[PDB]
C-alpha cells in the first residue's frame, strides 16, 4: 500500500539505469535508519554497503534516523567507494522524494568525491 | 495547513443557558451564547416523553362514572 | 457499399533470431509493442525496433508479465 506504491515509483528509473548500464547508488530510507549500497551495473552483486545499522556508523551519531545520520552514511559510502575505487556512479533515489534525507546522503557523497 | 486561505480559528467560550461553559476553537469571531447543550437537553438526560399512545380507556374512566 | 481497403504496411519481423545485424538496421516493424526493446535495441516513434550495436539478434521472454524482448549479443 505504502510499500507497493513506492516500488513502482522506483521501478520507472531502475529499468532505465538497467538499460544504460550505470553503476547504481541505491539508497533506502526508514523512519529509524538509512541504508546505502553501491550495486554493480548488472545488479547481481553489490560493491560496497554502508548504513546506520552498522555499529561503526551508529556509535558516532546522536540518532540513526535523521539528516545527520544520512550525512554520515553518505560520507562513509563515498569514502568506502573510493577505498575500492568506483569513481562514476549514478544515483537511484529508490522512489523516495529527493529532498529530505536522500538529499543529505547525496550531498555528502557529492562533497566527498563520488562524481554524479 | 496553508497560511492565508483558511479563516481564523480563535478559542472562544460559549456559555450554555443552564449554566455550562465550554471553551471551543471556532471561527465566529466573537464570544457566543447558547441555550441548549449536551447537558440539559430533553433527549440527552432521559426525559424523552412519548405521548400516551392511546389514553382512550383512561379517557372513558376519567369522563364517565 | 464496400470495396474500400488500404495498402498493406509490410510489417512483421524483418531480422529473425540468430541473424547478424549492423547498427541502425531494423529488426521489427510493428504497430503496438508485440516485442519490446531489450539490450542494445532501440524503439522508434513508430514503435520500430532497431539495432544499436552489431551482433546477433536474440528473442527472449522476460518480465513478470511474460512479455517478449529483443536483445543483441554484441558480436
Amino acid at each position: 500500500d505504502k510499500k507497493s506504491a513506492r516500488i513502482r515509483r522506483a521501478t520507472r528509473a531502475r529499468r532505465k539505469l538497467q538499460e544504460l548500464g550505470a553503476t547504481r547508488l541505491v539508497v533506502h530510507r526508514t523512519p529509524r535508519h538509512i541504508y546505502a549500497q553501491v550495486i554493480a551495473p548488472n545488479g547481481s552483486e553489490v560493491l560496497v554497503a554502508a548504513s546506520t545499522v552498522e555499529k561503526a556508523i551508529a556509535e558516532q551519531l546522536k540518532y540513526t534516523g535523521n539528516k545527520d545520520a544520512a550525512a554520515a552514511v553518505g560520507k562513509a559510502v563515498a569514502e568506502r567507494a573510493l577505498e575500492k575505487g568506483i569513481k562514476d556512479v549514478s544515483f537511484d533515489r529508490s522512489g523516495f522524494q529527493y529532498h529530505g534525507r536522500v538529499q543529505a546522503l547525496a550531498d555528502a557523497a557529492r562533497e566527498a568525491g563520488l562524481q554524479f | 495547513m496553508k497560511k492565508d486561505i483558511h479563516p481564523k480559528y480563535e478559542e472562544i467560550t460559549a456559555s450554555c443557558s443552564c449554566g455550562n461553559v465550554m471553551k471551543i476553537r471556532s471561527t465566529v469571531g466573537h464570544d457566543l451564547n447558547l441555550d441548549v447543550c449536551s447537558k440539559c437537553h430533553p433527549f440527552f438526560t432521559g426525559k424523552q416523553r412519548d405521548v400516551a399512545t392511546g389514553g382512550r380507556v383512561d379517557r372513558f374512566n376519567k369522563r364517565f362514572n | 457499399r464496400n470495396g474500400r481497403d488500404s495498402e498493406a504496411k509490410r510489417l512483421g519481423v524483418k531480422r529473425f533470431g540468430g541473424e547478424s545485424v549492423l547498427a541502425g538496421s531494423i529488426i521489427v516493424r510493428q504497430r503496438g509493442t508485440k516485442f519490446h526493446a531489450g539490450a542494445n535495441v532501440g524503439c522508434g516513434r513508430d514503435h520500430t525496433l532497431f539495432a544499436k550495436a552489431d551482433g546477433k539478434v536474440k528473442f527472449e521472454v522476460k518480465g513478470p508479465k511474460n512479455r517478449k524482448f529483443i536483445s543483441i549479443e554484441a558480436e
Binding site: - | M1, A14, I24, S26, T27, V28, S38, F43, F44, Q48 | -
Partner: protein, 177 residues
Amino acid sequence: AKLHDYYKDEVVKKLMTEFNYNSVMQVPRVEKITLNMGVGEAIADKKLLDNAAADLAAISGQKPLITKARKSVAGFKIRQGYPIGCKVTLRGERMWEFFERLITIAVPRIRDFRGLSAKSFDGRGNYSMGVREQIIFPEIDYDKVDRVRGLDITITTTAKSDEEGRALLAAFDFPFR
C-alpha cells in the same frame, strides 16, 4: 482536544473491558470526519456554489475543496468536469474540535431532534448522518440567510464491523435513538 483525552483514557479503557482486545492497537480509533455539501445547483448559477463554499468554510474550520463531476450524466444536465459539490476533510485536532462541537453544541439544535439513526452504519463501522439545515451550527449569523443548504457528515472509523464502531461512538455518549 478534550474529547481526544476523554477517548485516550475512558474509551480505550471501556473498549478493552467490553470486547476482549489483545492489544491497545486493536481498539477502534476514529480516523477522519468528512463534511460533504452536495449543492448540485451549479449547472446554471455559479455564485451559489461560491456561497456554499463559504458555508462549509464557516461550519468547518478550513476552506473546502470544490468537487467536480466524475462522469457526465444527461439525466441531471451535468457534464464531465463541472463543479457540482464541495467537501471538507478534517482530521486530527480539528476533527476532535469539530466532533466535540457537533456532539455538544450543534446536535441539540436540529429542530425537533428526536434522536438520530443508529442503523446508518454502512457495514465497516463508518457512520454517516445528514443534517438538513446548516443553521444548527452556531457559526451562522441568521441575518445573512441565503438558502437551506444542508450537508452530510461522515465519521470514518478504523473499526471492522458495525458493533465495534457503535461501541466506539456510543462510548462518547452519542445520541442513538
